């Protein structure tokens, strides 16, 4: 459970993300894809991309990055009271996209990395810790829905 102070650190850097959601999404998905190639394989939509330049040029990838970050921002703004937002997501990711919880840990790490590169002044160690907690809560809650559905893992 994040404290109010922690939530404030989280949403303060997230307000910064909102200035350029598309650029953040592309950086995050590209980082995810490059660092963990097995993740790109889950995307029939994007598996034709072989290089970072191709990824950076993809308008559809940028479009999905916005979809992803928009869903995550709505979750973060609920400050833990994200039951309704998390349900559709867990259902599709477990049963439809078949995304292991480990891959959610990978994108969390890509998120934290990109937030740090783009917002050093509002992403000091305290903010990083707070964001990590927020992302851990998200994973924890998603994981519980996965287990229920028979996909824990
Ligand atoms: C911060 C975490 C994530 C969020 C908020 C997020 C959000 C979304 C949203 C909003 C959608 C569209 C609606 C839906 O199908 O539920 C979606 C689709 C999808 N997501 Fe995620 N996602 C996350 C992480 C992941 C990860 C890590 C992977 C893969 C390693 C993944 C794979 C997919 C796939 C394959 C689709 C369908 C893409 C398509 O073909 O249109 N997601 N996600």
Please answer whether residues 147 and 95 qualify as being in contact, where contact means their C-beta atoms are separated by less than 8 angstroms: no
Q: Which of 82, 89, 136 to mutate to test the pocket of ligand 1 (most atoms within 8 A of CB)?
A: 89
CATH ID of 1-153, from 3.10.20.90, 1.10.490.10, 1.10.10.350, 1.10.3720.10? 1.10.490.10
What separation in Å is there between the alpha carbon of 98 and the centre of ligand 1?
10
48 is in an annotated binding site: no
Q: Render the burial of 56-72: b for 16+ CB within 10 Å, e for the rest.
A: eebeebbebbeebbeeb
From CA 117, how far away is CA 133, in angstroms rounded?
19
Residue 50: Cβ-neighbour burial (10 angstroms; 0-12, 13-18, 19+): exposed
Q: Where are the domains positioned within the chain?
A: 1-153
Which residue CA neighbors atom 6 of ligand 1 most closely? 68
In the numeric block, which tokens belong to residue 115? 């937030």
Nearest ligand 1 atom to alpha carbon 42: 35
Q: Is the CB of 137 under 6 A from ligand 1?
A: no
Angle at 40 between CA 69 and CA 18, to 5 degrees: 15
From CA 47, how far away is CA 54, in angstroms rounded?
11
From CA 45, how far away is CA 57, in angstroms rounded?
14
Question: Resolution in angstroms for this experimental structure?
Answer: 1.7
Q: Render the burial of 73-97: b for 16+ CB within 10 Å, e for the rest.
A: bebbeebeebeebbeebbeebbeee
């Amino acid at each position: 459970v994040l404290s109010e102070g922690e939530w404030q650190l989280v949403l303060h850097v997230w307000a910064k993300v909102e200035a350029d959601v598309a650029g953040h999404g592309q950086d995050i998905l590209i980082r995810l894809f490059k660092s963990h190639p097995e993740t790109l394989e889950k995307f029939d939509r994007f598996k034709h991309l072989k290089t970072e330049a191709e990824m950076k040029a993809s308008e559809d990838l940028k479009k999905h990055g916005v979809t992803v970050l928009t869903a995550l921002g709505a979750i973060l703004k609920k400050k833990g009271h994200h039951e309704a937002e998390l349900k559709p997501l867990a259902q599709s990711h477990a049963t439809k996209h078949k995304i292991p919880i480990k891959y959610l840990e990978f994108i969390s790490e890509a998120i934290i990395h990109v937030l740090h590169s783009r917002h050093p002044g509002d992403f000091g160690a305290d903010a990083q810790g707070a964001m990590n907690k927020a992302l851990e809560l998200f994973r924890k809650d998603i994981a519980a829905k996965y287990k229920e559905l028979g996909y824990q893992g």
